[PDB]
């Protein structure tokens, strides 16, 4: 029910996580989605809990229900200030609403289906189609790209503007396994 008042907090590496861009004179930021329930680290405006399909877990900081199943865990989408070289994450509060629209779906599907440990060093943006695999282009890719690049990270998606174009979740999960630049 509360929002900690802090300026930033450095947390250890999450057991796993995924980075997504948030498009807000346009403004882009990054969110990292990590296991656990930390609504208290969020601005009150981001303290919105949305759910994966079929009672299979949820995510704080996400503004719309996720149209596929989760892996039965609770997650929190945290504003990502910086990731340290040792993998520590630095989180800050931002005055903004929760993640809206479908662009976080690529990262979220990976998180619950393909990512077991660690945080891919890359930013995923894109909507997941009804087959639950094909990646659909999203809005504001150019601003998503700037946000990723400001943190020295490649943008992964399925459209002009990304750094690495991948057609479906399996190809994205594979980039996870091989690396980029």
Say what the resolution is, in angstroms. 2.3
Residue 57: closest CA among 42, 40, 74, 41: 74
Residue 144: closest CA among 89, 106, 95: 106
- What is the pairing mode between strands 127-128 and 135-136? antiparallel
Using what technique was this structure determined?
X-ray
Cα separations in angstroms, 67 against 13, 56, 58, 70, 122: 28, 11, 12, 10, 23
Whether the Cβ atoms of residue 81 and residue 41 lie closer than 8 Å to each other: no
Copy the structure tokens of residue 38.
Answer: 């930390």
Whether the Cβ atoms of residue 112 and residue 33 lie closer than 8 Å to each other: no
End-to-end CA distance of the chain: give it in Å, rounded: 41
What residue has token string 């656990």? Answer: 36
Domains and CATH numbers, the chain: 1-181 (3.30.230.110)
Own/partner long-range contacts of 138-146 (Cβ < 8 Å, ≥24 apart):
138/101, 138/102, 138/103, 139/23, 139/101, 139/103, 140/23, 140/26, 140/28, 143/21, 143/23, 143/26, 143/27, 143/28, 144/21, 144/23, 144/28, 144/103, 145/21, 146/28
Whether the Cβ atoms of residue 110 and residue 32 lie closer than 8 Å to each other: no
Rounded Cα gap, residues 110 and 105, in angstroms: 8
- Three-state secondary structure of the chain: CCCCCCCCEEECCCCECEEEEEECCCCEEEEEEEECCCHHHCCHHHCCEEEEECCCEEEECECCCEEEECCCEEEEEEEEEEECCCCCEEECCCCCCCECCCCCHHHHHHHHHCCCCECCCCEECCEECCCCCEEECCCCHHHHHHHHHCCCCCEEECCECECEECCEHHHHHHHHHHCCC
């Amino acid at each position: 029910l509360e929002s900690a008042n802090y300026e930033e907090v450095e947390l250890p590496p999450p057991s796993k996580g995924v980075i997504v861009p948030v498009v807000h004179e346009a403004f882009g930021s990054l969110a990292i989605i990590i296991p656990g329930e930390y609504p208290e680290l969020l601005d009150a405006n981001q303290q919105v809990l949305s759910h994966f399909a079929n009672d299979t877990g949820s995510v704080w900081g996400i503004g719309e229900d996720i149209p596929f199943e989760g892996d039965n865990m609770c997650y929190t989408a945290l504003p990502l200030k910086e990731i340290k070289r040792n993998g520590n994450i630095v989180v800050e509060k931002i005055f903004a609403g929760p993640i809206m629209g479908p662009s976080a779906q690529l990262g979220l599907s990976l998180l619950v289906n393909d990512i077991e440990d660690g945080v891919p060093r890359m930013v995923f943006t894109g909507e997941i189609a009804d087959d639950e695999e094909t990646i659909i282009p999203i809005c504001g890719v150019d601003i998503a790209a700037i946000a990723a690049h400001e943190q020295g990270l490649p943008l992964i998606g399925n459209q002009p503007g990304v750094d690495e174009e991948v057609r479906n979740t399996s190809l994205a999960a594979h980039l996870i396994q091989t690396g980029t630049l």
